[PDB]
């Protein structure tokens, strides 16, 4: 079907490498990087929505990052 829950949630930990280990890092990094490289306008809109939220600067930057990570996965 469509959902198919990922198994890296319950990663079995042992000295031997797991089934597809060499790919996780670039997996998530590449998905986000590609999605952003396609649509920059949303980077602008996310900057604005972050700036209008949050009092201090730290909260604003954290909001920027969390929006930029939520939108690519549509999670």
């Amino acid at each position: 079907a469509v959902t198919l829950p990922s198994h890296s949630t319950r990663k079995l930990q042992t000295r031997s490498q797991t089934w597809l280990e060499s790919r996780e890092y670039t997996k998530h990094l590449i998905r986000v990087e590609n999605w952003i490289f396609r649509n920059p306008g949303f980077a602008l809109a996310a900057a604005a929505i972050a700036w209008l939220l949050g009092s201090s600067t730290s909260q604003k930057v954290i909001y920027l990052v969390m929006i930029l990570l939520i939108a690519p996965a549509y999670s």
């Binding site: 198994h7 031997s16 089934w19």
Partner: protein
């Protein structure tokens, strides 16, 4: 088919092999205490060559 999904859905699952009705796992973890009080030294009472 959706198999290509189950191959990527599995990430962080151990690989195992199978012979007959038995399955050999090659990645594990065992805890054993070693009673080494019935070991002797074979070399004792040997002339220096």
């Amino acid at each position: 088919s959706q198999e290509g999904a189950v191959h990527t859905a599995l990430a962080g699952a151990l690989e195992a092999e199978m012979d007959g009705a038995k399955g050999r796992l090659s990645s594990g973890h065992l805890k054993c205490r070693l009673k080494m009080d019935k070991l002797r030294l074979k070399g004792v009472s040997y002339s220096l060559c």
